[PDB]
PDB file of C-alpha atoms in Angstrom:
ATOM      1  CA  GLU A 172     -18.641  18.743 -39.018  1.00 36.92           C
ATOM      2  CA  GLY A 173     -20.829  16.526 -37.638  1.00 31.71           C
ATOM      3  CA  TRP A 174     -20.973  14.010 -40.138  1.00 30.50           C
ATOM      4  CA  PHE A 175     -22.851  10.774 -39.883  1.00 30.49           C
ATOM      5  CA  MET A 176     -20.494   7.975 -39.695  1.00 29.16           C
ATOM      6  CA  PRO A 177     -21.941   4.819 -37.182  1.00 30.65           C
ATOM      7  CA  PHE A 178     -19.003   2.467 -38.121  1.00 29.23           C
ATOM      8  CA  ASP A 179     -15.120   3.592 -36.902  1.00 29.95           C
ATOM      9  CA  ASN A 180     -13.700   1.482 -39.309  1.00 28.97           C
ATOM     10  CA  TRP A 181     -14.249  -1.167 -42.541  1.00 33.69           C
ATOM     11  CA  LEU A 182     -12.645  -3.819 -44.021  1.00 33.14           C
ATOM     12  CA  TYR A 183     -12.629  -4.986 -48.261  1.00 35.10           C
ATOM     13  CA  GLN A 184     -11.076  -8.155 -49.604  1.00 36.37           C
ATOM     14  CA  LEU A 185     -12.761  -9.975 -51.768  1.00 36.10           C
ATOM     15  CA  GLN A 186      -9.778 -12.951 -52.571  1.00 39.66           C
ATOM     16  CA  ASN A 187      -8.686 -15.382 -49.401  1.00 37.14           C
ATOM     17  CA  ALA A 188     -10.933 -13.626 -47.236  1.00 41.18           C
ATOM     18  CA  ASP A 189     -10.900 -15.819 -43.228  1.00 40.02           C
ATOM     19  CA  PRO A 190     -14.586 -15.084 -41.291  1.00 40.02           C
ATOM     20  CA  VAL A 191     -12.561 -15.989 -38.438  1.00 39.83           C
ATOM     21  CA  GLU A 192      -9.306 -13.767 -38.542  1.00 39.67           C
ATOM     22  CA  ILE A 193     -11.612 -11.355 -40.116  1.00 42.99           C
ATOM     23  CA  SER A 194     -13.980 -11.856 -36.680  1.00 46.26           C
ATOM     24  CA  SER A 195     -11.297 -10.934 -34.569  1.00 44.99           C
ATOM     25  CA  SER A 196      -9.819  -7.374 -36.591  1.00 48.12           C
ATOM     26  CA  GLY A 197     -11.387  -5.010 -34.828  1.00 50.85           C
ATOM     27  CA  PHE A 198     -12.504  -4.376 -37.940  1.00 49.78           C
ATOM     28  CA  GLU A 199     -16.449  -3.564 -37.136  1.00 46.67           C
ATOM     29  CA  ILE A 200     -17.706  -4.457 -41.255  1.00 48.24           C
ATOM     30  CA  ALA A 201     -16.413  -6.316 -43.492  1.00 53.11           C
ATOM     31  CA  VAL A 202     -17.003  -6.612 -48.029  1.00 52.13           C
ATOM     32  CA  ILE A 203     -16.466  -9.994 -49.610  1.00 50.30           C
ATOM     33  CA  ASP A 204     -16.766 -12.260 -51.734  1.00 53.16           C
ATOM     34  CA  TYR A 205     -19.951 -14.239 -51.187  1.00 52.80           C
ATOM     35  CA  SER A 206     -17.294 -17.146 -52.661  1.00 52.98           C
ATOM     36  CA  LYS A 207     -13.713 -18.476 -51.197  1.00 52.32           C
ATOM     37  CA  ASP A 208     -12.461 -18.009 -54.674  1.00 51.60           C
ATOM     38  CA  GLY A 209     -15.227 -16.351 -56.840  1.00 50.76           C
ATOM     39  CA  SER A 210     -16.874 -19.650 -58.452  1.00 50.80           C
ATOM     40  CA  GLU A 211     -19.528 -21.644 -56.820  1.00 49.29           C
ATOM     41  CA  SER A 212     -18.004 -24.207 -55.352  1.00 50.02           C
ATOM     42  CA  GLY A 213     -16.407 -21.604 -53.129  1.00 53.95           C
ATOM     43  CA  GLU A 214     -19.682 -20.431 -51.902  1.00 55.37           C
ATOM     44  CA  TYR A 215     -19.030 -19.427 -48.410  1.00 52.24           C
ATOM     45  CA  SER A 216     -21.493 -21.152 -45.888  1.00 49.28           C
ATOM     46  CA  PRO A 217     -24.273 -20.364 -43.245  1.00 52.50           C
ATOM     47  CA  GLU A 218     -22.566 -20.949 -40.590  1.00 54.28           C
ATOM     48  CA  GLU A 219     -19.611 -19.544 -41.871  1.00 56.09           C
ATOM     49  CA  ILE A 220     -21.093 -16.347 -42.274  1.00 55.07           C
ATOM     50  CA  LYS A 221     -22.642 -16.511 -38.717  1.00 58.27           C
ATOM     51  CA  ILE A 222     -19.195 -16.203 -36.823  1.00 61.40           C
ATOM     52  CA  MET A 223     -18.076 -12.981 -38.051  1.00 61.13           C
ATOM     53  CA  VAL A 224     -22.072 -11.964 -37.567  1.00 63.24           C
ATOM     54  CA  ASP A 225     -21.547 -13.998 -33.567  1.00 65.12           C
ATOM     55  CA  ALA A 226     -18.549 -11.981 -33.094  1.00 68.05           C
ATOM     56  CA  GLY A 227     -20.313  -8.243 -34.043  1.00 64.87           C
ATOM     57  CA  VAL A 228     -19.521  -8.053 -37.674  1.00 65.50           C
ATOM     58  CA  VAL A 229     -21.104  -6.615 -40.205  1.00 67.08           C
ATOM     59  CA  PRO A 230     -20.791  -9.196 -43.411  1.00 66.94           C
ATOM     60  CA  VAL A 231     -21.217  -7.277 -46.794  1.00 66.13           C
ATOM     61  CA  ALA A 232     -21.560  -9.245 -50.001  1.00 64.56           C
ATOM     62  CA  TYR A 233     -20.085  -7.985 -53.090  1.00 65.66           C
ATOM     63  CA  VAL A 234     -21.534  -7.608 -56.380  1.00 65.63           C
ATOM     64  CA  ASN A 235     -20.605  -6.499 -59.258  1.00 66.11           C
ATOM     65  CA  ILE A 236     -24.277  -5.615 -61.850  1.00 66.39           C
ATOM     66  CA  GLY A 237     -22.826  -3.682 -64.186  1.00 65.90           C
ATOM     67  CA  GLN A 238     -20.360  -6.411 -66.164  1.00 65.31           C
ATOM     68  CA  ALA A 239     -20.650 -10.270 -66.025  1.00 63.27           C
ATOM     69  CA  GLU A 240     -17.606 -12.310 -64.346  1.00 59.22           C
ATOM     70  CA  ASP A 241     -16.850 -15.337 -66.628  1.00 59.09           C
ATOM     71  CA  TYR A 242     -16.282 -17.237 -62.949  1.00 57.10           C
ATOM     72  CA  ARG A 243     -19.479 -16.442 -61.794  1.00 58.63           C
ATOM     73  CA  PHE A 244     -22.265 -19.532 -60.853  1.00 57.84           C
ATOM     74  CA  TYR A 245     -24.636 -18.047 -64.011  1.00 60.34           C
ATOM     75  CA  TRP A 246     -21.519 -18.020 -66.684  1.00 59.44           C
ATOM     76  CA  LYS A 247     -22.693 -20.054 -69.688  1.00 60.71           C
ATOM     77  CA  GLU A 248     -20.572 -21.627 -72.628  1.00 60.77           C
ATOM     78  CA  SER A 249     -22.985 -21.178 -74.912  1.00 61.17           C
ATOM     79  CA  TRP A 250     -22.261 -17.544 -75.235  1.00 56.27           C
ATOM     80  CA  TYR A 251     -19.226 -17.268 -76.812  1.00 55.21           C
ATOM     81  CA  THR A 252     -20.512 -19.138 -79.733  1.00 57.08           C
ATOM     82  CA  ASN A 253     -24.926 -17.594 -79.457  1.00 57.29           C
ATOM     83  CA  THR A 254     -23.749 -13.903 -77.829  1.00 56.13           C
ATOM     84  CA  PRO A 255     -27.131 -13.163 -76.085  1.00 55.37           C
ATOM     85  CA  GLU A 256     -27.390  -9.464 -76.916  1.00 53.02           C
ATOM     86  CA  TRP A 257     -26.711  -7.964 -73.340  1.00 52.53           C
ATOM     87  CA  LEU A 258     -23.088  -9.473 -73.568  1.00 52.83           C
ATOM     88  CA  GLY A 259     -20.799  -6.939 -74.477  1.00 54.56           C
ATOM     89  CA  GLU A 260     -17.444  -6.469 -74.101  1.00 55.58           C
ATOM     90  CA  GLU A 261     -14.546  -7.898 -71.937  1.00 58.23           C
ATOM     91  CA  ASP A 262     -13.359  -5.600 -69.616  1.00 55.58           C
ATOM     92  CA  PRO A 263      -9.822  -4.440 -70.809  1.00 58.61           C
ATOM     93  CA  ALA A 264      -8.632  -3.799 -67.490  1.00 60.94           C
ATOM     94  CA  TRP A 265     -10.379  -6.532 -65.609  1.00 58.59           C
ATOM     95  CA  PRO A 266      -9.546  -9.842 -67.734  1.00 58.46           C
ATOM     96  CA  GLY A 267     -13.085 -11.543 -67.471  1.00 59.70           C
ATOM     97  CA  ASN A 268     -15.306  -8.999 -66.767  1.00 60.55           C
ATOM     98  CA  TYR A 269     -17.350  -8.043 -69.581  1.00 61.82           C
ATOM     99  CA  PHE A 270     -19.280  -5.282 -70.166  1.00 61.49           C
ATOM    100  CA  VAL A 271     -23.418  -5.827 -69.752  1.00 65.21           C
ATOM    101  CA  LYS A 272     -26.757  -4.180 -71.259  1.00 62.81           C
ATOM    102  CA  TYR A 273     -27.971  -4.701 -67.116  1.00 62.99           C
ATOM    103  CA  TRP A 274     -31.186  -3.660 -67.894  1.00 66.65           C
ATOM    104  CA  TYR A 275     -32.153  -6.001 -70.493  1.00 68.39           C
ATOM    105  CA  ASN A 276     -34.284  -8.932 -68.377  1.00 64.12           C
ATOM    106  CA  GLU A 277     -31.944 -11.365 -68.480  1.00 63.94           C
ATOM    107  CA  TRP A 278     -29.141  -9.973 -67.154  1.00 68.10           C
ATOM    108  CA  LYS A 279     -31.600  -8.379 -63.895  1.00 69.04           C
ATOM    109  CA  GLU A 280     -33.117 -12.382 -63.636  1.00 71.11           C
ATOM    110  CA  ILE A 281     -29.441 -13.271 -63.434  1.00 74.70           C
ATOM    111  CA  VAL A 282     -28.242 -10.676 -60.711  1.00 72.25           C
ATOM    112  CA  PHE A 283     -31.737 -11.238 -58.548  1.00 72.13           C
ATOM    113  CA  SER A 284     -30.451 -15.018 -59.091  1.00 74.43           C
ATOM    114  CA  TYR A 285     -26.965 -13.775 -57.569  1.00 75.45           C
ATOM    115  CA  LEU A 286     -28.843 -11.904 -54.539  1.00 74.91           C
ATOM    116  CA  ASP A 287     -31.506 -14.468 -53.812  1.00 77.38           C
ATOM    117  CA  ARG A 288     -27.619 -17.014 -52.716  1.00 80.24           C
ATOM    118  CA  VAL A 289     -26.115 -14.112 -50.850  1.00 77.25           C
ATOM    119  CA  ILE A 290     -29.276 -13.567 -48.591  1.00 77.22           C
ATOM    120  CA  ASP A 291     -29.353 -17.332 -48.501  1.00 76.67           C
ATOM    121  CA  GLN A 292     -26.250 -16.995 -46.631  1.00 76.52           C
ATOM    122  CA  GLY A 293     -26.268 -14.453 -44.118  1.00 80.18           C
ATOM    123  CA  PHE A 294     -24.979 -11.360 -45.553  1.00 78.78           C
ATOM    124  CA  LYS A 295     -26.934  -7.988 -43.135  1.00 79.34           C
ATOM    125  CA  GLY A 296     -25.703  -5.980 -46.315  1.00 78.36           C
ATOM    126  CA  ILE A 297     -25.001  -5.364 -50.841  1.00 74.26           C
ATOM    127  CA  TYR A 298     -21.940  -4.291 -52.401  1.00 72.25           C
ATOM    128  CA  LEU A 299     -22.724  -2.871 -55.794  1.00 72.97           C
ATOM    129  CA  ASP A 300     -20.673  -2.720 -58.150  1.00 72.82           C
ATOM    130  CA  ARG A 301     -20.108  -0.970 -61.526  1.00 69.85           C
ATOM    131  CA  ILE A 302     -23.407   1.432 -61.188  1.00 67.48           C
ATOM    132  CA  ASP A 303     -20.570   3.617 -63.737  1.00 66.42           C
ATOM    133  CA  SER A 304     -21.725   1.058 -66.417  1.00 64.87           C
ATOM    134  CA  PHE A 305     -23.814   3.931 -66.939  1.00 66.14           C
ATOM    135  CA  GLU A 306     -21.508   5.830 -68.759  1.00 65.91           C
ATOM    136  CA  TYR A 307     -19.282   3.141 -70.497  1.00 64.86           C
ATOM    137  CA  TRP A 308     -22.520   2.407 -72.951  1.00 61.36           C
ATOM    138  CA  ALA A 309     -23.180   6.065 -72.561  1.00 64.83           C
ATOM    139  CA  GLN A 310     -19.334   6.459 -74.030  1.00 63.76           C
ATOM    140  CA  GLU A 311     -19.449   3.820 -76.250  1.00 64.46           C
ATOM    141  CA  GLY A 312     -22.711   6.033 -77.816  1.00 64.77           C
ATOM    142  CA  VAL A 313     -25.644   3.408 -77.110  1.00 61.93           C
ATOM    143  CA  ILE A 314     -27.893   4.840 -75.769  1.00 63.58           C
ATOM    144  CA  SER A 315     -28.185   8.118 -73.892  1.00 64.94           C
ATOM    145  CA  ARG A 316     -27.153   9.102 -70.973  1.00 66.39           C
ATOM    146  CA  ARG A 317     -29.997   9.871 -69.216  1.00 67.69           C
ATOM    147  CA  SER A 318     -30.937   6.801 -70.631  1.00 71.12           C
ATOM    148  CA  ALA A 319     -28.505   4.719 -69.033  1.00 70.38           C
ATOM    149  CA  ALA A 320     -28.343   6.652 -66.135  1.00 69.55           C
ATOM    150  CA  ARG A 321     -32.465   5.577 -65.181  1.00 71.48           C
ATOM    151  CA  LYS A 322     -31.646   2.232 -66.706  1.00 70.74           C
ATOM    152  CA  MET A 323     -29.395   1.991 -63.412  1.00 72.13           C
ATOM    153  CA  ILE A 324     -31.030   4.157 -61.344  1.00 73.68           C
ATOM    154  CA  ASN A 325     -34.356   1.923 -61.740  1.00 72.85           C
ATOM    155  CA  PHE A 326     -32.313  -1.666 -61.487  1.00 74.44           C
ATOM    156  CA  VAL A 327     -30.507  -0.373 -58.487  1.00 73.70           C
ATOM    157  CA  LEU A 328     -34.490  -0.566 -57.024  1.00 73.79           C
ATOM    158  CA  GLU A 329     -35.366  -3.430 -58.427  1.00 71.10           C
ATOM    159  CA  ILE A 330     -32.385  -4.782 -56.414  1.00 70.94           C
ATOM    160  CA  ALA A 331     -33.197  -3.245 -53.159  1.00 67.06           C
ATOM    161  CA  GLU A 332     -36.711  -3.959 -53.386  1.00 65.14           C
ATOM    162  CA  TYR A 333     -35.949  -7.697 -54.403  1.00 62.43           C
ATOM    163  CA  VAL A 334     -33.869  -7.748 -51.144  1.00 59.78           C
ATOM    164  CA  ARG A 335     -35.784  -6.079 -48.610  1.00 57.72           C
ATOM    165  CA  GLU A 336     -38.809  -7.989 -49.104  1.00 56.18           C
ATOM    166  CA  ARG A 337     -36.395 -10.436 -47.948  1.00 53.63           C
ATOM    167  CA  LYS A 338     -34.646  -8.657 -45.168  1.00 55.58           C
ATOM    168  CA  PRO A 339     -36.129  -5.790 -44.702  1.00 53.76           C
ATOM    169  CA  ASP A 340     -33.213  -4.325 -42.923  1.00 52.42           C
ATOM    170  CA  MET A 341     -30.595  -4.966 -45.565  1.00 48.86           C
ATOM    171  CA  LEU A 342     -27.617  -2.448 -46.641  1.00 46.84           C
ATOM    172  CA  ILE A 343     -27.494  -1.266 -50.256  1.00 45.36           C
ATOM    173  CA  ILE A 344     -24.411   0.516 -50.362  1.00 44.50           C
ATOM    174  CA  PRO A 345     -22.857   1.446 -54.071  1.00 43.63           C
ATOM    175  CA  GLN A 346     -19.589   1.437 -55.022  1.00 43.56           C
ATOM    176  CA  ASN A 347     -18.485   4.380 -57.542  1.00 46.84           C
ATOM    177  CA  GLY A 348     -21.330   6.534 -59.922  1.00 46.03           C
ATOM    178  CA  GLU A 349     -21.585   8.528 -57.491  1.00 49.37           C
ATOM    179  CA  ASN A 350     -22.783  11.342 -60.715  1.00 47.46           C
ATOM    180  CA  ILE A 351     -25.823   8.851 -61.627  1.00 48.18           C
ATOM    181  CA  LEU A 352     -28.101  11.090 -58.674  1.00 45.86           C
ATOM    182  CA  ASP A 353     -27.831  14.223 -61.222  1.00 48.50           C
ATOM    183  CA  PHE A 354     -30.619  11.661 -62.516  1.00 48.87           C
ATOM    184  CA  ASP A 355     -32.096  11.211 -59.444  1.00 50.81           C
ATOM    185  CA  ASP A 356     -36.152  12.363 -58.195  1.00 48.87           C
ATOM    186  CA  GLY A 357     -34.836  11.395 -54.176  1.00 46.59           C
ATOM    187  CA  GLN A 358     -35.292   7.469 -54.388  1.00 47.38           C
ATOM    188  CA  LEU A 359     -32.516   6.428 -55.197  1.00 49.82           C
ATOM    189  CA  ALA A 360     -30.678   9.132 -52.094  1.00 50.45           C
ATOM    190  CA  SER A 361     -33.171   7.950 -49.977  1.00 47.45           C
ATOM    191  CA  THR A 362     -32.558   4.065 -50.938  1.00 46.58           C
ATOM    192  CA  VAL A 363     -29.802   3.114 -50.732  1.00 45.10           C
ATOM    193  CA  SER A 364     -28.217   2.829 -47.070  1.00 49.20           C
ATOM    194  CA  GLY A 365     -24.547   4.204 -48.096  1.00 54.86           C
ATOM    195  CA  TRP A 366     -22.656   4.934 -51.264  1.00 54.73           C
ATOM    196  CA  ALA A 367     -18.574   3.081 -51.416  1.00 55.57           C
ATOM    197  CA  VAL A 368     -15.924   5.678 -53.275  1.00 52.36           C
ATOM    198  CA  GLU A 369     -12.336   4.161 -55.133  1.00 52.81           C
ATOM    199  CA  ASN A 370      -9.750   6.306 -55.520  1.00 54.45           C
ATOM    200  CA  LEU A 371     -10.831   9.893 -53.570  1.00 53.61           C
ATOM    201  CA  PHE A 372      -7.470  11.640 -52.362  1.00 51.71           C
ATOM    202  CA  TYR A 373      -6.057   9.728 -54.744  1.00 51.00           C
ATOM    203  CA  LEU A 374      -5.858   6.929 -57.561  1.00 50.23           C
ATOM    204  CA  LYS A 375      -3.123   4.860 -56.190  1.00 48.31           C
ATOM    205  CA  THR A 376       0.322   6.587 -55.201  1.00 49.06           C
ATOM    206  CA  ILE A 377      -0.771   9.608 -56.820  1.00 51.40           C
ATOM    207  CA  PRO A 378      -2.997  12.361 -55.358  1.00 50.80           C
ATOM    208  CA  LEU A 379      -5.840  13.582 -56.821  1.00 51.91           C
ATOM    209  CA  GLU A 380      -5.926  16.900 -58.057  1.00 54.40           C
ATOM    210  CA  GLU A 381      -8.718  19.243 -56.203  1.00 54.04           C
ATOM    211  CA  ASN A 382     -11.699  20.298 -57.978  1.00 55.72           C
ATOM    212  CA  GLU A 383     -11.844  16.112 -59.090  1.00 54.27           C
ATOM    213  CA  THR A 384     -11.988  15.204 -55.625  1.00 57.43           C
ATOM    214  CA  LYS A 385     -14.013  18.415 -54.521  1.00 56.48           C
ATOM    215  CA  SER A 386     -16.590  17.614 -57.543  1.00 54.59           C
ATOM    216  CA  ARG A 387     -16.677  13.871 -55.933  1.00 57.18           C
ATOM    217  CA  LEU A 388     -18.088  15.020 -52.853  1.00 55.53           C
ATOM    218  CA  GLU A 389     -20.466  17.726 -53.590  1.00 57.32           C
ATOM    219  CA  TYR A 390     -22.530  13.819 -54.091  1.00 60.51           C
ATOM    220  CA  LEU A 391     -21.325  12.156 -50.909  1.00 60.75           C
ATOM    221  CA  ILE A 392     -21.552  15.620 -48.523  1.00 61.84           C
ATOM    222  CA  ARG A 393     -25.427  15.421 -49.852  1.00 59.32           C
ATOM    223  CA  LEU A 394     -25.637  11.724 -49.190  1.00 57.00           C
ATOM    224  CA  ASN A 395     -23.810  12.172 -45.088  1.00 57.04           C
ATOM    225  CA  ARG A 396     -25.842  15.114 -45.104  1.00 58.92           C
ATOM    226  CA  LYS A 397     -29.350  12.251 -45.499  1.00 59.22           C
ATOM    227  CA  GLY A 398     -27.627  10.274 -43.063  1.00 62.19           C
ATOM    228  CA  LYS A 399     -26.058   8.186 -45.397  1.00 61.28           C
ATOM    229  CA  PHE A 400     -22.553   6.536 -44.491  1.00 62.52           C
ATOM    230  CA  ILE A 401     -19.541   6.985 -46.615  1.00 62.97           C
ATOM    231  CA  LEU A 402     -16.640   4.176 -47.675  1.00 61.55           C
ATOM    232  CA  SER A 403     -13.854   5.442 -48.646  1.00 59.69           C
ATOM    233  CA  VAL A 404     -10.888   3.156 -49.845  1.00 61.15           C
ATOM    234  CA  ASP A 405      -7.677   4.503 -51.878  1.00 60.73           C
ATOM    235  CA  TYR A 406      -4.769   1.918 -52.848  1.00 60.92           C
ATOM    236  CA  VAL A 407      -2.479   3.923 -51.173  1.00 57.66           C
ATOM    237  CA  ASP A 408      -0.662   1.030 -49.623  1.00 58.57           C
ATOM    238  CA  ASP A 409       2.421   0.648 -51.092  1.00 60.98           C
ATOM    239  CA  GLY A 410       3.417  -2.029 -48.389  1.00 60.15           C
ATOM    240  CA  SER A 411       6.505  -0.136 -47.363  1.00 62.24           C
ATOM    241  CA  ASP A 412       7.369   0.535 -43.997  1.00 62.27           C
ATOM    242  CA  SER A 413       8.337   4.017 -46.122  1.00 59.83           C
ATOM    243  CA  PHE A 414       8.031   7.546 -44.812  1.00 59.14           C
ATOM    244  CA  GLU A 415       6.619   8.355 -47.660  1.00 61.91           C
ATOM    245  CA  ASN A 416       3.668   5.392 -47.747  1.00 62.83           C
ATOM    246  CA  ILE A 417       3.321   5.982 -43.920  1.00 63.79           C
ATOM    247  CA  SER A 418       2.756   9.558 -44.307  1.00 66.25           C
ATOM    248  CA  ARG A 419       0.798   8.823 -46.979  1.00 66.11           C
ATOM    249  CA  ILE A 420      -1.824   6.877 -45.666  1.00 67.23           C
ATOM    250  CA  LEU A 421      -2.349   9.152 -42.300  1.00 69.23           C
ATOM    251  CA  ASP A 422      -2.723  12.178 -45.197  1.00 69.97           C
ATOM    252  CA  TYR A 423      -5.779   9.545 -47.116  1.00 67.82           C
ATOM    253  CA  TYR A 424      -6.926   9.263 -43.347  1.00 67.51           C
ATOM    254  CA  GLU A 425      -7.310  12.133 -42.765  1.00 67.01           C
ATOM    255  CA  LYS A 426      -8.963  13.843 -45.641  1.00 66.60           C
ATOM    256  CA  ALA A 427     -11.952  10.652 -45.506  1.00 67.77           C
ATOM    257  CA  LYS A 428     -12.435  11.595 -41.735  1.00 69.94           C
ATOM    258  CA  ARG A 429     -12.950  15.516 -41.903  1.00 71.25           C
ATOM    259  CA  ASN A 430     -14.978  14.432 -44.791  1.00 70.30           C
ATOM    260  CA  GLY A 431     -17.383  11.847 -43.035  1.00 72.06           C
ATOM    261  CA  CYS A 432     -15.763   9.151 -45.082  1.00 69.98           C
ATOM    262  CA  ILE A 433     -14.575   5.746 -43.242  1.00 69.37           C
ATOM    263  CA  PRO A 434     -10.927   5.209 -44.605  1.00 72.49           C
ATOM    264  CA  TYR A 435      -9.969   2.135 -45.471  1.00 75.74           C
ATOM    265  CA  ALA A 436      -5.940   2.108 -46.788  1.00 78.00           C
ATOM    266  CA  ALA A 437      -5.779  -1.116 -49.802  1.00 75.56           C
ATOM    267  CA  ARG A 438      -2.383  -2.070 -51.352  1.00 69.92           C
ATOM    268  CA  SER A 439      -1.673  -0.553 -54.973  1.00 68.23           C
ATOM    269  CA  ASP A 440      -1.843  -3.865 -56.775  1.00 70.70           C
ATOM    270  CA  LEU A 441      -6.003  -3.696 -56.076  1.00 71.30           C
ATOM    271  CA  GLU A 442      -5.831  -7.182 -55.371  1.00 73.35           C
ATOM    272  CA  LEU A 443      -7.525  -7.624 -52.356  1.00 75.77           C
ATOM    273  CA  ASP A 444      -6.012 -10.044 -51.431  1.00 74.57           C
ATOM    274  CA  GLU A 445      -5.403 -10.037 -47.828  1.00 76.01           C
ATOM    275  CA  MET A 446      -7.052  -8.182 -44.579  1.00 72.69           C
ATOM    276  CA  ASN A 447      -4.307  -4.885 -44.633  1.00 68.18           C
ATOM    277  CA  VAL A 448      -3.739  -3.766 -40.780  1.00 71.68           C
ATOM    278  CA  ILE A 449      -1.280  -1.154 -40.178  1.00 73.28           C
ATOM    279  CA  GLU A 450       0.225  -1.249 -36.816  1.00 73.73           C
ATOM    280  CA  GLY A 451      -1.377   2.099 -35.214  1.00 72.14           C
ATOM    281  CA  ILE A 452      -3.428   3.237 -37.630  1.00 72.91           C
ATOM    282  CA  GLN A 453      -6.035   0.575 -39.553  1.00 70.71           C
ATOM    283  CA  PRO A 454      -7.764  -0.846 -38.234  1.00 70.48           C
ATOM    284  CA  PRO A 455      -7.894   2.543 -35.402  1.00 70.61           C
ATOM    285  CA  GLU A 456      -6.398   2.166 -31.952  1.00 71.29           C
TER     286      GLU A 456
END
């Protein structure tokens, strides 16, 4: 099983997201960027977000709280020549993203300023990326793993408190870093609305080992019990109509659903740059 699954589907699209297309899609919850192009000038208007809300879609805003993104409104050119102590190295897997010491006041305040705009736009939730920065800094030896974990839990709670002062029913959904719950006293578990995970059954088109998947599910199943919904995205769609591709999608859908996760099969290029519609599958019939 009696899984908590309050949405029949979900969409994840961080580029080229079109409110009008989203609103008539049958997707029930949509995680998008707060801007048409990532930049301040591309910020979606209250009106554009209302198009989705009026159609019954819950829009949710992506916010990277674990890294600075150099195309965002907050990025200062003086950071090159006068680098803040909290501004760390560029992510080799994501050019333009930089790991941040997210526990420093300046970064938290950048992020609240980001949340300020997201609320005014009319977003009904926030989707919090790079939780797993707690692991980056621990793996670099910069602070202890428990310190890094506690600081991130606390940051997420201060975020919750910020947004729900203004919008009491705001959805709060972390992405990945679910093993941070080893360091929680209960308050993070109870404060989130749900949790999202990338790469749960497949890493792109390659299946994960059962033991690796099982360890992640232990965290997520316990959250589901508490009435927290689980969003899953695996990047399993290679874009073809091959048997191998379509059966992998169905297998991923199957595995997600029997474990209380609401699946979305994304394109294997990780670009999240269209609304990935798969006939007879996504969204369901």
